[PDB]
């Protein structure tokens, strides 16, 4: 029996706080990404990379923030973007009420073990069955062009596509995702945390906010909350596999000037 009471109002104020902070830290929102992907925007139409010739023409026309072999140049761009995302995700984490009042080593631990799960959650916003938006919406790289890259690069992004097509069928919006990502950041089961209880306390309040958001926002999906927790479980798997591919590449094949 749901009521609009001081408790529910506080959970709506938390959801709004997170949404505002989310779209501040990540201004290519799902709403804007979907508008670009469905051609329902007045913004510039992305340049499509669908084969080796369009990639060569794209390196020019698409204007990347970054500055011999195609697959390695693409992987290096991917690496650069993930470094910028770690800073964006940290800036979002600092907005979650309670997070900066945690032990600094636990703040670092939650972000260290959380950022990949959050990257692949947010990447789904940018993906459809054809491909992925790159360079903040200026480019679109096809899923089959990425699969055509030589081993081991060909198989790098395909598991993220697989996750995204099922994740996107849940039809979450930015208001849902902002809370979902906060829930993933405040995971009390990360290795090497010093003080778990205060993390579980924040996560409990975020779970209450997520449950209410999904009830208000998704009238025809009664178990969406459960389906989202099932996805948080599945992201753990995606990231385990991802760190394995990253090792193969490191042992078998220059980085962001922020590291230098």
């Amino acid at each position: 029996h749901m009521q609009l009471n001081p408790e529910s109002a506080d959970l709506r104020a938390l959801a709004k706080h997170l949404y505002d902070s989310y779209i501040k830290s990540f201004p290519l929102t799902k709403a804007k990404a979907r508008a670009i992907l469905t051609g329902k925007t007045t913004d510039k139409s992305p340049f499509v990379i669908y084969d080796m010739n369009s990639l060569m023409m794209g390196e020019d026309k698409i204007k990347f923030k970054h500055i011999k072999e195609v697959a390695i140049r693409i992987f290096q761009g991917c690496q650069f973007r993930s470094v910028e995302a770690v800073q964006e995700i940290t800036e979002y984490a600092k907005s979650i009420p309670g997070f900066v009042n945690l032990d600094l080593n636990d703040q670092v631990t939650l972000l260290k073990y959380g950022v990949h799960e959050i990257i692949y959650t947010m990447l789904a916003s940018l993906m459809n069955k054809d491909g992925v938006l790159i360079s903040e919406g200026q480019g679109f790289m096809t899923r089959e062009f990425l699969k055509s890259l030589r081993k081991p690069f060909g198989d790098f992004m395909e598991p993220k596509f697989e996750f995204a097509v099922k994740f996107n069928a849940l039809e979450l919006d930015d208001s849902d995702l902002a809370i979902f990502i906060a829930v993933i950041i405040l995971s009390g089961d990360r290795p090497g945390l010093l003080n778990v209880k205060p993390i579980e306390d924040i996560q409990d309040n975020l779970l209450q906010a997520l449950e209410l958001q999904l009830k208000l926002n998704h009238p025809e999906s009664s178990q969406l909350f459960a389906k989202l927790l099932q996805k948080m479980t599945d992201l753990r798997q995606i990231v385990t596999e991802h760190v394995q591919l990253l090792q193969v590449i490191k042992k078998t094949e220059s980085l962001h000037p922020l590291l230098q």
């Binding site: 770690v86 800073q87 940290t90 600092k94 670092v108 972000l111 950022v115 980085l255 590291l259």
Partner: peptide
Amino acid sequence: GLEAIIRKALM
């Protein structure tokens, strides 16, 4: 290098 970027971004 992940932790370095995080500590950098936190402080």
